[PDB]
Every structure is written in C-alpha cells, then in structure tokens.
C-alpha cells in the first residue's frame, strides 16, 4: 500500500513544510502512482486547461468558432494580463484567447473563455460531460486563486485531473484536430521550465500548464513524452499553511524527479 515512490514523496513533503498531491499515469501500462490522490487542492491557473478544452469542444460543431472576435475593454483587465492589455478597445479571437490563457497564463483571456462557456458552471458542466465528477470551477479570475485551506471552490483532486488531462490530450474526449491543437498549445507553454520540467531529463518533451495562488500554492499539470517510452501524465499540486507563503516550484521539480527515477 505504501510504495517506495510514495515513501519518497512523503519525505519530500515532510521537508517542504506544505501539502503535496501527486498523480502519475503511465500510458505504457496504464498504471497509476498516487500521493494524496483523492484530496482536494486549489487548481489556480491549471483550471485554464479545462476552459480551453471546453471551447475546443464547442468548435467541433461550429464552423470557425476559433476565429470569432471577442471585444476586450479596459474594464475587463484583471491582475495579470500580458496579452490582453495589448488589445484593449480591440478584439481577440477565441484561438488567440485560448493561446494567451494556456501559454502566457493571461487571466483576462481565461475570463473570456469562462464567459464563452456561460460562466464557471459551464466549465464544470464540460468536465462532467467528459467523465470528471470531481472538478469544480466556481469563480472567475482573479478570485478563483484565493486557495484557502479547506475551501472546496475551484478545486479538484490529483487523481481526477490526471485522468481528465489524459482523456483530453491522449484519449478521445476531443476530436482529432482539437486534441492536436491542445497538445500544440501545451507544448508551447512559456511558464513551465522551473516546475515539472526541471525535474526531468532534458531529452523528455513536456507540455504543461502551471498555476500559483495564495497560501504559497504552486501547481503544474503535464503530459510528458519520455525518450523511448509511451507518454506519461503527471499532476503535482502543492499548498502551504500561511496565506503569504512563498512559491515552491522546486518542490514540483523534486516530485517529478522522484517519479522519473521510479519508472
Ligand atoms: C494562475 O495560477 N495565475 C495566473 C498567472 N499564472 O502564471 S503561472 O502559471 O506561471 O503561475 C499568475 C499567477 C496566478 C494568479 N494568482 O493569478
């Protein structure tokens, strides 16, 4: 019941001063490694994968949805808007908003995705439609990042997020073109090199989405293509007891290294 990898993650967690959640799926054999795999964690920016995937699903039944313009007004800007601020009083397409949300983690872009789905509950509804009974999105940006201990809003579990990420990127939750677009976007992420990627050999290819929030919450969810192996799906969630705790991306890298060394 407690594997060697689980014992190592427990030792990492003990030295980290926070709470660590890990779910690995190895698609070479569909085996799973779970650490606090059924405990809820605040998703923060990693929830953007579900919102972008839901808009990709919408695009399966709409000619050129991704080219549809969305107006960006000054009042739409929130706390972190590296792409959207360039387009205030103009428009961005849903493809541009999806890329900005995933690759630059633009929070104004994420709010446009949420609105395109009918609000946070529309993102949750998409999760349910692809078999994820755990994910819940409750708020918009930026308050979905409050990451308060014990608060179920805007949370999921590592087990559920790993299974969902596998279905979206490697399975058939999306159509073929849409799945390929999602993987292309994730592989072009700009924010991930200090997190899961840092713990892996340079030769392994990664597409990922990071997140962070209050309580020193530090997250990453990744699809990994190891050299000479079938892909892996890896979720590393981390959160700490005090609201102003510092980020700990090194803990995510350490967890990824333990997983890689255990394969
Ligand atoms: C998402 O977690 N956020 C938006 C942006 N994400 O960048 S990260 O993925 O590199 O952390 C800034 C942090 C965070 C937020 N609190 O809005």
UniProtKB/TrEMBL annotation:
Belongs to the class-A beta-lactamase family. InterPro entries: Beta-lactam/transpept-like, Beta-lactam_cat, Beta-lactam_class-A, Beta-lactam_class-A_AS, Cefotaximase. GO terms for molecular function: beta-lactamase activity; metal ion binding. The keyword NADP does not apply. SUPFAM superfamilies: beta-lactamase/transpeptidase-like (SSF56601). The keyword Signal applies. Zn(2+) binds at residues 141, 145. This is Beta-lactamase. Its EC number is 3.5.2.6. Residues 21-236 form the Beta-lactamase class A catalytic domain. It is an enzyme of class 3 (hydrolase). The modification Pyrrolidone carboxylic acid is found at residue 1. Keywords: Antibiotic resistance, Hydrolase, Metal-binding, Plasmid, Pyrrolidone carboxylic acid, Signal, Zinc. GO terms for biological process: beta-lactam antibiotic catabolic process; response to antibiotic. Gene3D superfamilies: DD-peptidase/beta-lactamase superfamily. It comes from the Bacteria. Pfam families: Beta-lactamase2. The gene is blaCTX-M-14. It catalyses: a beta-lactam + H2O = a substituted beta-amino acid.
